[PDB]
Amino acid sequence: LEWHEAPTIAVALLAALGFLSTLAILVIFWRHFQTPIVRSAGGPMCFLMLTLLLVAYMVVPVYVGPPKVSTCLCRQALFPLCFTICISCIAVRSFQIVCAFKMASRFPRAYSYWVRYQGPYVSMAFITVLKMVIVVIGMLAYRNSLLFNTSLDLLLSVVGFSFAYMGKELPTNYNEAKFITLSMTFYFTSSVSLCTFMSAYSGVLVTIVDLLVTVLNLLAISLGYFGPKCYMILFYPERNTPAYFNSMIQGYTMRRD
């Protein structure tokens, strides 16, 4: 996996672009805090996923180079962990949104349990604990091991899709159906093509193909979820105001029909 070789240069510069974009989003969110947009994006959960994205982008060059047990361990230690944490956080936010906007009265008792047992902080913690057991047991035994991780990630993604599916009509700041569908489709097609390509291939430069697939997945899962928000709050400051959020939710709830 040579340092001077045309695909490796392109993925390296693309990872640098992703790192710079994530840094810009982090600084933008930190500067414009206590605003309706960031609080409606997840609050500290956004930072939790964003710094994890930063560290995932930083260790991309570790993938490329001479094989090393550190690199092979980090392959599944951080990048799939990034995918899983990001997907679980997005799905948890979608469930919270669809539970505040709907089924708070349809399923009243269940919401009391959900908010009384620290559901947002427990459903995320369970996901991390569950996956790390799968990761270590996976290494105990390219296609077979990745199949379990892709199945888990796709199950999480389809859970998020099925839960945001009922929320097409939610306001544009609480509706992420488009991003969820795009990211789920991209992850599914990339994983399927990759798994097909593991078997019928030469066996060399497949590492570069897999690295490019993972880096593109990270780039999409960061941009499609954060770029629109910072676009709104940098170019349309009028659209970032508590009065505007009040008016938008009020207009959604009591529709003229």
The one-letter code for the residue type at 68 is K
Extract the tokens encoding 87. 């997907």
The contacts of residue 107 (CB under 8 Å, 6+ apart) are none
In the chain, the N- to C-terminal Cα span, in Å, equals 61
Residue whose pair of structure tokens reads 């990761």 in the numeric block: 135
Extract the tokens encoding 72. 């092979």
At residue 64, φ and ψ (nearest 5 deg) are -95, 135
Question: How is residue 117 annotated by DSSP?
Answer: T
Elucidation method: cryo-EM
What is the C-alpha separation between 116 and 114, in angstroms, rounded?
6
What is the C-alpha separation between 63 and 50, in angstroms, rounded?
20
Extract the tokens encoding 44. 């500290």
Extract the tokens encoding 192. 């399927």
The answer to whether the beta carbons of residues 160 and 87 sit under 8 Å apart is yes
Nearest partner of 48 among 29, 65, 66, 67, judged by Cα: 29
Question: Which strand (E) or helix (H) includes residue 168?
Answer: none
- Inter-CA distances, 116 with 70, 102, 113, 121, 123, Å: 42, 18, 5, 11, 13
Nearest partner of 19 among 65, 50, 49, 62, judged by Cα: 50
Nearest partner of 15 among 55, 49, 43, judged by Cα: 55
Residue whose pair of structure tokens reads 């097409």 in the numeric block: 168
What is the C-alpha separation between 218 and 57, in angstroms, rounded?
8
Helix (H, G, I), strand (E, B) or coil at 134: helix
Nearest partner of 184 among 151, 158, 215, judged by Cα: 158
Handedness of CA 84, 90, 92, 95 (dihedral sign): negative
The contacts of residue 134 (CB under 8 Å, 6+ apart) are 148, 149, 152
For residue 6, how many other CB atoms are within 10 A of its CB? 8
What is the C-alpha separation between 220 and 226, in angstroms, rounded?
10
What is the C-alpha separation between 151 and 14, in angstroms, rounded?
27
Characterise 201 by phi-psi region: left (phi > 0), alpha (psi -120 to 50), beta (else): beta
CATH number of 6-253: 1.20.1070
